Amino acid sequence: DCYHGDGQSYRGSFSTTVTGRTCQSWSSMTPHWHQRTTEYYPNGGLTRNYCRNPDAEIRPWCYTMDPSVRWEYCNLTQCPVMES
Amino acid sequence: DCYHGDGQSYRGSFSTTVTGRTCQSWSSMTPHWHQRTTEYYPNGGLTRNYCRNPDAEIRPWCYTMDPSVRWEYCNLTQCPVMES
Ligand SMILES: O=C(Nc1cccc(C[C@H](C(=O)O)[C@H]2CCNC2)c1)Nc1cccc(C[C@H](C(=O)O)[C@H]2CCNC2)c1
Ligand SMILES: [Mg+2]
Ligand SMILES: [Mg+2]
């Protein structure tokens, strides 16, 4: 599993962070209150707790289930790019 | 005590909400995490837990100490305006 571009188009089910924390569901406000929901970002693919990039960070990310860690980049790398 | 204009200029010590809740200190991330701190909004007068309006809401406001109520308008009204 990997993302293309900056990962705005990523639509897989990867849901864990670079430090092995569990992503929080986008629809949930717990533990972290936020405004990155599917209503606010309808083009973001914000479903379940899957890594996404609705607001054009540099790569896919999520809020985390650790109350002390608001959000992290997900443990995904960019897919091999087209080479000449 | 009262505010002028939309209350961006309010610099008094009123610190309670329209429902009688206590304002959270601007520098604190508890109970509510936020980005309305004096470093982000240096022109906002964000000190202690006093009602302010750093981001041009319609009137002064604060985050609250009730974990279930993120922010409210403060219990302040507009000062009597200049009449012709
Ligand atoms: O938040 C933002 N703009 C905002 C606009 C209108 C209302 C509000 C809501 C304000 C509150 O409840 O704090 C109210 C209070 C009264 N006045 C407005 C916030 N923008 C924002 C910009 C950059 C970064 C972030 C943090 C964001 C996050 O950590 O959630 C990250 C996550 C990964 N990508 C970004 C947020
Ligand atoms: Mg790479
Ligand atoms: Mg009035």
Author numbering:
A (entry chain B), B (entry chain A): 0 to 83
Published text:
The linkage of two molecules that contain the crucial LSN3353871 KIV domain interaction motif created a dimeric molecule, LSN3441732. This dimeric compound inhibits the formation of Lp(a) particles in vitro with an IC50 value of 0.18 nM (n = 8), representing an increase in potency of three orders of magnitude compared with the parent monomeric molecule, LSN3353871 (IC50 = 1.69 µM; n = 43) and two orders of magnitude compared with an optimized monomeric ligand, LSN3374443 (IC50 = 36 nM; n = 3). In direct binding assays, 3H-LSN3374443 bound to full-length recombinant apo(a) with a mean Kd value of 2.6 nM and an approximate maximum saturable binding (Bmax) value of 9.8 fmol ng−1 apo(a), equivalent to two to three ligands per molecule of apo(a). In comparison, 3H-LSN3441732 bound to full-length apo(a) with a 50-fold affinity increase of Kd = 0.05 nM and with Bmax = 4.9 fmol ng−1 apo(a), indicative of one ligand per molecule of apo(a). Notably, as observed with the monomeric compound LSN3353871, binding of LSN3441732 to KIV2 was ruled out using ITC. In Lp(a) transgenic mice, LSN3441732 plasma concentrations increased in a dose-dependent manner and steady-state plasma Lp(a) levels decreased after five days of oral BID dosing, with an ED50 of 4 mg kg−1 and a mean maximal inhibition of 79% at the 30 mg kg−1 dose. In cynomolgus monkeys, 2 mg kg−1 and 10 mg kg−1 oral BID doses of LSN3441732 decreased median Lp(a) levels by a maximum of 45% and 57%, respectively, after 5 days of dosing, and continued to suppress the steady-state levels of Lp(a) for 14 days. Compatible with a multivalent binding mechanism, LSN3441732 showed improvements in potency and efficacy both in vitro and in vivo compared with the monovalent inhibitor.
